[PDB]
Design a protein around this ligand. Structure first.
Ligand SMILES: O=C([SeH])c1ccccc1
Ligand SMILES: [Zn+2]
Length: 256
């Protein structure tokens, strides 16, 4: 699978029928249809920069992985009674500034999106066990609006020159990804999925109402990452955002 016209989001249903499921992501958050839920606690992140491990070119994107052997790095609060363990973050972006986010708010497309991914370590003993369970994953989504250069993005963007081609990886250490999160953690939450194969309906989405900035040049650095292996013809990673999917009667809740 990929984001080509041949192996792309429109085609994914052929090998992953769950792509047409009832809890697919991302979605368009219509603010007129959200339900304020008084029972939602604030989101609490506490991440240890020593859990930062490795940055990997996975062909369609790049992932920053964290050591997840204990609860040094955790998400709590929001709609959760369980503590969720940080295991990675990544970005989605588009071919132009005009699109690039996965989630949209009242039809508005942002330029990119940050995903900070966590697994239910109160209930399950590994990511591999949790990854397919309804309550297994918690992912913070942060819409990224084109404007001023984001200096917190800096260590991440500086590391891409070492992982230019598919399968390259490099140490990436001493980093707290809570430094990328907006000042306000007022959020929307809905039950949904991974936004690429295998599209498991295992994610409680936490979508921040506040955006973060990214420059046109910072976005170009993402699109300059290559999906080919070293030695082959260079194929830029131009986009990796899935279209929004039908809510099919799910409710998006607002903490605010
Ligand atoms: O959240 C999404 Se999209 C996801 C993809 C790979 C690993 C973890 C989460
Ligand atoms: Zn993602």
């Amino acid at each position: 699978w990929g984001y080509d016209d041949k192996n792309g989001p429109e085609q994914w249903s052929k090998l992953y029928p769950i792509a047409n499921g009832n809890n697919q992501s991302p979605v368009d958050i219509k603010t007129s249809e959200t339900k304020h839920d008084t029972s939602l606690k604030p989101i609490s992140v506490s991440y240890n920069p020593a859990t930062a491990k490795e940055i990997i070119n996975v062909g369609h994107s790049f992932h920053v992985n964290f050591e997840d052997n204990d609860n040094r790095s955790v998400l709590k609060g929001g709609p959760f009674s369980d503590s969720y363990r940080l295991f990675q973050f990544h970005f989605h972006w588009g071919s132009t500034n005009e699109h690039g986010s996965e989630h949209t708010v009242d039809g508005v497309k942002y330029s990119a999106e940050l995903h900070v991914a966590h697994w239910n370590s109160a209930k399950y003993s590994s990511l591999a066990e949790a990854a397919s369970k309804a309550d297994g994953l918690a992912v913070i989504g942060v819409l990224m609006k084109v404007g001023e250069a984001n200096p917190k993005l800096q260590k991440v963007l500086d590391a891409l020159q070492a992982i230019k081609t598919k399968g390259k990886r490099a140490p990436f250490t001493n980093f707290d990804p809570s430094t990328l999160l907006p000042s306000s953690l007022d959020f929307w939450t809905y039950p949904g999925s991974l936004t690429h194969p295998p599209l498991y309906e295992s994610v409680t989405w936490i979508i921040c109402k506040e955006s973060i900035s990214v420059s046109s040049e910072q976005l170009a650095q993402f699109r300059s990452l290559l999906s080919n292996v070293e030695g082959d013809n260079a194929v830029p990673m131009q986009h990796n955002n899935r279209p929004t999917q039908p809510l099919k009667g799910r409710t998006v809740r607002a903490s605010f």
